[PDB]
Design a protein around this ligand. Sequence first.
Ligand SMILES: Nc1ncnc2c1ncn2[C@@H]1O[C@H](COP(=O)(O)O)[C@@H](O)[C@H]1O
Ligand SMILES: Nc1ncnc2c1ncn2[C@@H]1O[C@H](COP(=O)(O)O)[C@@H](O)[C@H]1O
Lengths: 125, 124
Amino acid sequence: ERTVADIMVPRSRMDLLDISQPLPQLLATIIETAHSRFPVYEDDRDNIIGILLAKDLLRYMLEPALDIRSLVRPAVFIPEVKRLNVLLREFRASRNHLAIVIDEHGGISGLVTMEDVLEQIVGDI
Amino acid sequence: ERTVADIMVPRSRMDLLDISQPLPQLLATIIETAHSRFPVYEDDRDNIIGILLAKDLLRYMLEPALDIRSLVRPAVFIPEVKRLNVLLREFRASRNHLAIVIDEGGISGLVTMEDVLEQIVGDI
Ligand SMILES: Nc1ncnc2c1ncn2[C@@H]1O[C@H](COP(=O)(O)O)[C@@H](O)[C@H]1O
Ligand SMILES: Nc1ncnc2c1ncn2[C@@H]1O[C@H](COP(=O)(O)O)[C@@H](O)[C@H]1O
């Protein structure tokens, strides 16, 4: 059956956020992209420190001293070889619908979402 | 063969935003619910006038006096009798993947591309 590697967004195509950027710059980057969720890095683009849901930045208006770093949630890292039918079940049961994909040696390969899985599964039927 | 009415999110489960509501009240609702898109009404919950993408509110922090109305995008209203295979084609042919569902019109619910795909995968 198919694997994550067949459907992932490749590493080179990922829209990422650098945690060291000032807020006004982060906002501009996010607004320019039509995605809701961003892997976040620090110091090197493969040094992923989590996932930011864009809408969480609205808490700037609800907390006097918002630390953006505290909004970054742990990423789910999944292997390239993970099969789609199992991943679908995982995503459906989970609060996280975006995973970072890693190769057989642990390198960052890409990202994948529940939508990508559903589309490929339906595309094969 | 299956229709939108089979799989739609019922009216009662729809997270709607009153566009006239004070900013702090809007923010509280948008943050606490795990949705990216919200149908917006004015005056009457029946009067859905478009859809707000949560992330578009991030503009407020650059322009706090913006007309929030200016962020609202037009809605699409489809009949609940529409067939799922037709909707899937139509959604794939489009950038907009959320529709408001109207009865035999009055609002009866909402449906996304994800809902359509989930149903098709469950019918394998
Ligand atoms: N941060 C991102 N960088 C690149 N592609 C993404 C990102 N987030 C989501 N995607 C991809 O874009 C599609 C739509 O996701 P979304 O934009 O979050 O609705 C996903 O199903 C993936 O195909
Ligand atoms: N404003 C909303 N109110 C109620 N349900 C929604 C709303 N937006 C999306 N949904 C449903 O929840 C699912 C997840 O969408 P989202 O929360 O936008 O990722 C969709 O496929 C719809 O079934």
